[model samples]
Target chain A: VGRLEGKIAIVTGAASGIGAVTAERLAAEGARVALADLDAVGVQTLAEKIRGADGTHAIGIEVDLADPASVRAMVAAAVEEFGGLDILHNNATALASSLDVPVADADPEVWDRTMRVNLSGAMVATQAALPHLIARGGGCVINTSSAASGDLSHPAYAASKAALISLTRSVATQAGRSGVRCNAIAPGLIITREAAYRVMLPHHLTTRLGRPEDVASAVVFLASDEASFITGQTLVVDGGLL
Target chain B: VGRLEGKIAIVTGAASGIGAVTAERLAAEGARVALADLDAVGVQTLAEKIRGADGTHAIGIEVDLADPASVRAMVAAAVEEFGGLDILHNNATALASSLDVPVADADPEVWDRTMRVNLSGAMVATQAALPHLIARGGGCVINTSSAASGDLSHPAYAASKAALISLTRSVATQAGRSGVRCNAIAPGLIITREAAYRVMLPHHLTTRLGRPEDVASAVVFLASDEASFITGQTLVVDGGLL
Candidate 1:
């Protein structure tokens, strides 16, 4: 049997990049999954692709993570459709125009929007899913943080990601008694589909930018029973970037 | 005016535990240190107190470590009285009694002392302080490994401790260019001299075992200008027990 047989999972930002890959991997591992993203048509198409391939129970929900109400409804749809929930991957994030801006130069509105969608959004989704996860006798929550949090650039993006790591630790330690485990994956220099052929690898190490499958494998490990002793830890999969 | 203020250091059990406390803390605050363990009388009489009450430059020595000529005119003792040489915290250890019974039986004389004192002894007192550390525009070495090399508990304390962390990376990646910066710190549960009683303790979270300062203040930060980017990447001060 697949490690995650019978488990039900929700993957945010599931329309593309690492999120889409993780959603597909979870489905292949026997999870009945809900793929969510702001790209309504894209997520629906992806879900159909999974259903067609593995015949797994899969659905798609349109979500604007910055909207707390939408985040709540998203969780409800997963439980209502899949019967219950076992894993929640809060991976959706919005960097907006803050990528090149230094901390002092960052526009307040842009920074606020980034935090609202990236930091607050993950919290809202996790909060909405908490009761259902607990009812299932404890479940896993995996937040997507980044190695950039340790770097000196992309202040807003870094801050939001750094906060996610702290949130992961808090949830894991405090909710341990409740059997809720929370962890984060800090991927290093991930190469998305578009960027795969366009970016130059850093001089220090690794021959190539991190692949989507690299993170997907990590998510699978953490979501499975194999990582039972592990909690409140961030697994960095960056080919030794840090 | 440099970070460590050009101080010297010495630590016992330099591979793990409280020794890590003295060594790393010194580095963080910008003090060079030395490490050693073994022998009862000689260690206490090394004038080995603080270099200035909080003088940063401190030394702790032991008699059984090496060549009788060198032991008498110890490198750390020379640095303490006259001043020179930087950074050494060996924290080498040997719990001999546990060794005899595990591999069949015991015969006191037949026991091999080679594994414990000699291997680590040379590293702490002489090897780390040798021409390289001195030549590299001054350097630092901190060693304190534990949980018995991945917690296999082989019972041969000397064997486990003698062969601690691989110093190759720190030497190769860092030591070559301008300065030397070697590292290791593995502290488990620590009870400082004072505050052993005045603490309102670990309930379920900490469990009255590890004190925060053990690593927080103990190893302030590696005593280098390049705190911006440092390596040998192993910091395990688990007051949280994990």
Candidate 2:
């Protein structure tokens, strides 16, 4: 049996890129995955792809992580289908209107957009998923933070990602006794998704940029029994960004 | 087969507490451990007990982590005995004269003592172990941070541990290309050693205090291949300190 055999997982931002690939890997791990994304058709197509590949149960939920009610409904969709939820992957982020401008020319509108989705969305999902996770005897939540966290640039994105980490710790602290573990994975410049349109380095050389599978490995591990003792931690999978 | 079979490891502060038990667990995981402590007798006794239990190779070295040269030489002892290094568990800390005093009456000397051992010693050990770990292709460093890390009390101890987490990120960013992973474990108020009488809570709970074996389990996981993609993380093994 696979590591997550029979477990139910809900992964947001699951339409493409790291989220999409990680969702597939979870299905392969034997999880009946709920693939959620803002892109309704994208997630539906991806869910079909996941089911076609592994013959495991998979569903797609169109979720606007920016909307708290939508986030709650996403969890409900997963539980209603899979019977109970064991893993929640808060993997969505907002690109906003543009990359962060300098301190002298910052845009509050953009910053707000980023926070509402990147950080706040995760919290909504966690609040929605907690009861099910607790009822199921204990599970894990893995957030998708970014190496952009602790950044000297892209201020808003950095701030939101960093906030996600703090939120991760807070969830672990509050829900731990009930047997829920929360963690984040921050990836350096990854290929295919974010890289295809925009790619930049933070003074680190790149022979091999991180792959979707690289991050999926981290997600699977964090969501597995092997990482049961781990919580309130942010695992970095940058494919050795040095 | 043991999870860490044939791996080489060194655990500092391995005299009689969390350090002692963690070293034993490492040895039990099949890592030939070099147990170092200022109390030569304690580590020796612990080492002998470890060997007696499983017949695995183990050694004890007495050294002051407050001394950089001693810290460096301690790694040398492990490499010398085991022929190489794969894991470095920087697990020592200084209690100083007392728990952290109020800011107005705080002693600078106590803070320095704590930093020299807790933060600086981990750095020295990492520097010394990097080459050996890189030479072996890849390995990991797991610092023993404390639940005291983000504390509102014990200022100096908290400051030092928080610094260790930052140091952990820097090391991961630096040595990642060389295939080395660095992480931390911030345990809650553990029993048996630090909790013999000085036990306290951060207003979280009282169902059960953390145990040394709980931490040892964390150490073994972070040191093993199962965590190969994990780096620059701090795993909390406080046994659900809720």
Candidate 3:
């Protein structure tokens, strides 16, 4: 009934935005999933909603991935409870500014925190997940890097995301022989639930701000068998911003 | 006599390869050159050769770019001896191995050393040269990244080069206001100097391979006033390898 009928996957930051959409789309395609997020209540609600829809293939786990123990537990719960793990889609980030600070006057603290949570966090989580992934006879890791690689306005965030791409290529080189693949998606400006309801202008008129589904589709494809030969590549889903 | 008639510049790894061509070419166009390389004897020989060509503006400085102290001294010698520094070209890369060492079978120590010398070394040299450059009202930084950013080979080296592109963008974002422009040129496979003589392939048969002068011309143009509006971009010179 689905392309990913036998796959077991883990999705982080899956309560909202592109992460949430990717989780739902994957579930609909017959993937058993462990969806993790800091938003416990929202995560639980989404999981139950997926179950009720008879997608029946997903469970919610509240995971503070910034902590090593939580990351291990997140992976353990997915493998022990689901019997094995097959795919990992790491979709999360933190902006250093107050979301309102202009580049000229923004506080440096924001940049520091953003790098810690977004960049460092990805490295820790991905490294922890690698062993299990390799053991599963080869799987896939899809990271959420960004079109920020092209946008020069946010230096710290963009640099950190670029580092994530670096990490992915490294993983691809060593882990591919074990059948494990690694890739990252660099989406342009995607309008999602987490975005401020009121921006300066309408999303549709502004050079086509990407839809969460646009990136969600790429995540599912890369995590599936469809992208077996593709690894260590960051697919820029920016509607040709590159 | 030239657009760069009054400019003073520093080039790293200038003993031979593209760096040597860049140094002499800059001098050819009326720029004063301070060429630093680990090849003290060879650099001295090249310096003498340039001076013999009536290019009295060229000199050799010996330094190991991997050491911070050495890099500091190299930048200091250029600024002090030349009276000021206006351009910094980071073109020194160690290409000791181009054999078939895929990521899985490759040694980690080799990967680490390559990254340190090729990527981190450029960063250290750039940081050391910034203050003197800023004091001169502004300058330019041109990092020699690689055209293989789109390829999946040489995991560590390719990833490091990709990171350099990101770093270039970040530096440009932070320094654009300071009148300092930063850009990276990614040259594909090139056959230059004696290397060209070794390869017997016709130009039509060789697609990706190019002359070292092909890329050096771009470097000179970017360093000159012709590229005033360009900043924080990688001009991939690989004959469309990716």
Candidate 4:
């Protein structure tokens, strides 16, 4: 029996990066997984790869998270196909802001878009999944936030991620009585495709730049029964960088 | 020379409780103080007490924190009287929810009033103080939160206090680039008054309850130049309550 042995888990933005790794980790541990992402082909490829590896209880869906209706349908399909939703990992990021831009030069449109997708997208998913989660006596909702050092490198991303912590607290206040636990993980530099080669190599990144698998492990634990009393809080898994 | 020898600081709800202790601490460290509170007499009494001790650097002003205009004037008086404002300690709390009542039996009015005083009170105080703080090239905002384990008899008070942690992060994110720093202290069980004694006495609250001086020391550390690198964080100053 696995930690999620018969549980149906929905992971958004699961086509690549940390989300993909998280989906694989949950599936490998016996969770029935619905891998949702905006990249349609990438989603299918990841899901097929998991199935080919004996992780047969998995499917892929293309989802546009900024749209509320899309979020509603995305969560519905997960529960409809997988029986019932037990965990939601909101891992989508709208790459609208320029990385490492100075505050004065930071684009306003990028700021708004980042808030729309990263902040509100989490809200939309939580709203859509609440009823189903409550029906199952409370499920886990984990949002992906970044390790912000109060530095001006990425103002928009930092602000949106900061707001995610607020959202986590608000959701916990509203849903804790229903058994739903809301949390966020603020991870430091991670060895994603963008960081490994495109920006900085994994080794060259922060000494503690988390592995895709490290984050996956954290998400799995939050979604586990072991974290019964934890809600409305965030766990910083950033190797002490922030 | 004192660390804050010539600095002007604004403190709200300074009539009693943690606010009173904080005012004394800041003054002892050599800052000029503007004490604002709804209890005009209590505010004046405390301010005069400080002055009578030849710590003549404090002034008392009457203000209702729920009123934005009053909050603005409180900040205005601080700047007008002392030339510039440099530090703020948002240490206000409403009357406590009795220890006897379970959450379901608790009054909504109590929760609403507590939020109005504790959460929104800090917001109003900060909004008025930020411009002056930024003008001075950054300052500190120290908020008081709690370590009320899920067992706090009144969930409403517990929830509002919990929100302060997020508010601290938001303030840090909003003000960090401008040199402003915001942090919060979550004291587990501060034995402030007879109310605490009544509730915790039966439980032999000494091991569980901390001295008021314990929290005062944290407030001083956060507001001082010593905590320059720390912001958007809550240091739980509890006696190790998980």
Candidate 5:
């Protein structure tokens, strides 16, 4: 049993990035999980792989966040399989920053639509899980708003992300009286050191790029009820760039 | 001639509260201003009174922020009547907090609409002003995102205001090289001392409630180009509440 022992959790955006490893760590902590994502990662194999690493119960489900119904189904399936939910890891997002245009020159129509669409799925996922969470007597929503939101680039991405932080603040305060916990994390580093620093040998001593385990560790702390007292804050996991 | 001498600016939401006093101070600082608002303040009188205090050029125009075209017109009239605009003060907002419900029981419909609408006016007004700002070579846009956004009440209000903060961040980062100084202030204190605390005769010193001039002074600084280096940050004037 781990810090998250006996917890029933659903981790979305488990396709790649930190999502898969994050769920793997969640399972390592003894939580029963329903892992879901939009990309076809051959989800089940990873789910089984993660479990075999720790002999924990886990299942994978593909969820298209663009479809509100699919988002709700992710939560429902999690509940059906796990019996109840203690944690909801909402990490799904579109990262198309290179194609993003700067403001003033950027279309408000384009900007506005992108903002709404980016935020919509998270809201949908949240609403679906709230009732089930309440029925379980309490819940936690750990949002993965990116660090790029704070940077002076990709106007749309920054705006979309900062909106999520504000949304997290709103939801945290709004759901305060209830037993649910809502908080967000802005991770500045994510890629592997090899993918990041361009060297493999004679390294591993002072790992510079943000390792996946840092995020994994942060999520574990948040989901394990150790972070129960903390809410409405977006913790920065970004090597203090902020 | 004041620090803002030869500067042309538009101050919105001037019907009452700090908006009127704020414009008064801006005019005192020698900016030619076109003030506008809804709520039937009988527009131009306040415009005249503020000028008599310091003898600066000023005008008042009625504007309904709900209508996007009205928003555009406010900017157009400012440019037309004042010859050009150097500063855009976005202060219009809807405060329906008494009617606001918490998130769990709150209608996502009710919540989401308020979020979009509150942010919509600011965005529309901003887009309309950006070109004019750049045309003038450089201009400042001072946004009044409320302090209530950081508070734990009025989920919709908080969410909406927080979105503006994020929007300000996006615009600041987006417009960084454009020479426009985009910044925001979250005024935590406001209301007349009498309206706030009864028995006003004893003292004006050690006041517990917020004075309107504090906000006025804040806006003056942001608009003054004295704060040129500052961008993408929300300055809090809430008596150190944060």
Candidate 6:
């Protein structure tokens, strides 16, 4: 039996990128997963692929995190289809602000939109799922923050992620009373797709960008009974970036 | 002028507990404060007492942390009265679950109620104030966790506080991009009143319980620019308490 046998999980932003890899890992560990993302077709395809690989019951839900109601509906549908909820991985991002802008030149509209989708949206999903989580005798909520959280640039993205970490802590603290745990994973630069080969700066801890599996491993550990003692923590998966 | 000469802060649960002492300390540092607590008379009296002694712009807002609207109103009153908000101290907690209870017998009702106040209430207050904090170009949110966050007992309290630490990191990550910083203080066993002579356990790092001011000092440091580079961290004020 796998460590997460019989558990149900929802991985937001699951259509592609790290979220997709994490969903695959969870299902491989015997979790029935709900793959949710704005890209409905991609998520559905990913869910089907997972279902085929492990024969675990997996479903996909299309979600627009910018809309609070959409987030709630996505979570509700997951709980309904899965008979309950156990784990949640909030991995979506709006990327609202331009990454190249300086602090003063950053658009307020991007900041507001990012806050709505990245920060407030995660909170909404967690809130909607809390009752179910409590009923299940406490589960886990693992958020995907980023190493960008500590960086000076990408203010909007960083702020939303930072807030997500706080939300993770808040949920962990409150839910622990009910047996729930919450934690976050801050991944460093990971090579997800084709990238131009570049030399590492002297201070770079690793010679190359990190692998997605490295992060998936940590996430699986945190979501499992093995991490029962850990809560409200952000385990940096960077190759010692800071 | 003091380092925080023009800053405004709101400290929840600022009646006669550690919150009261912290409010006093912040006022002494030249930060105007709004003391919020469920005890209408107690907070008001404390506020008046602080104002009288130090000439700080101290005010009190009666609050029911169990009520989300009340928490929002508390932040609003502080913003309106103080002209803007720069700092928040989420110190209120519903001590529902017995500190001595083991995980197996932890009461669900107590867990739910405690979470609503301690964990959810803090998030509600922070969410309501983020707009003003962003408007100010950045601010600080300091949450009070406990050493119990790492302990196995008092699962409810421990878990709630663990979550608070995570929330601290989330806020720091996202807000840092905006010049906002967030951090948490995890205080160890503190002696608030006169100590009836007590014996220290063998593992106790210090022979005596901690002082509230110890935590307050750390809070002051974090709220200042001195901690600008330090975000997404938990400053343990335990004097070696594990």
Q: Is the docking of candidate 5 incorrect, acceptable, medium or high quality?
A: acceptable
**Candidates' C-alpha lDDT:** 0.62, 0.80, 0.74, 0.74, 0.73, 0.75
- iRMSD value for model 5: 2.9
Better model by TM-score, 2 or 5? Answer: 5
lDDT of 4 by residue, B13-75 (tens): 788877788788888878889998999999989999988866558999999866657777888
lDDT of 6 by residue, A50-156 (tens): 88865748999999976768888999999999899999888853244344233334443454555556655676777677788889888988888643423445644
Tell how far residue A13 is off in model 6, in angstroms.
18
- Candidate 5 backbone collisions, by pair: none
Best-matching candidate per lDDT = 2
The reply for model 1, stretches above 4 Å from the true place, is: A53-56, A93-100, A146-152, A193-202, B1-240
| Docking quality category of candidate 3 according to DockQ thresholds | incorrect
CAPRI quality band, candidate 1: incorrect
Expressed as tens digits, the lDDT of each residue in A95-180 for candidate 3 is 33235132333333444445445654565566667777888888988899643333445654665577578768777866777888
Q: Give the candidate number with the greatest TM-score.
A: 5
The candidates' DockQ values read 0.04, 0.18, 0.13, 0.05, 0.33, 0.05
lDDT (Cα, tens digit) per residue for candidate 5, span A1-242: 59898988888878677888889888888888889887656677788787786664898898876667788788898888878988888784343555555555554555445554455567667778887777888878888864343345556566667667766777777676778888888887456344544453233333465777888889999887768899888888866545
**Candidate 4 segments whose C-alpha is farther than 4 A from its true place:** A1-6, A12-81, A92-143, A146-185, A191-242, B1-7, B24-31, B36-77, B92-141, B150-183, B191-242
lDDT, candidate 2, A114-231, per-residue tens: 8998899999999999999999999989999753433445787778878998998888888877888888888876664545523444334322456677788778777877557567
Docking class of 2: incorrect
What tens digits encode model 1's per-residue C-alpha lDDT throughout B1-242? 43456565555553334554555456456665554445444333332453445553444555455354444345646465536665555554234435534445544442455443534454545453655355635555556554322234444543544355555243424442334555555555445453553343332233234542444332444434322133343444542245
Worst 10 residues of 5 chain A by lDDT: A198-207
> Per-residue lDDT tens digits of candidate 6, residues B119-211?
667767776777788899788888886434344456556645655665566566656767777788888766665345255334457766678
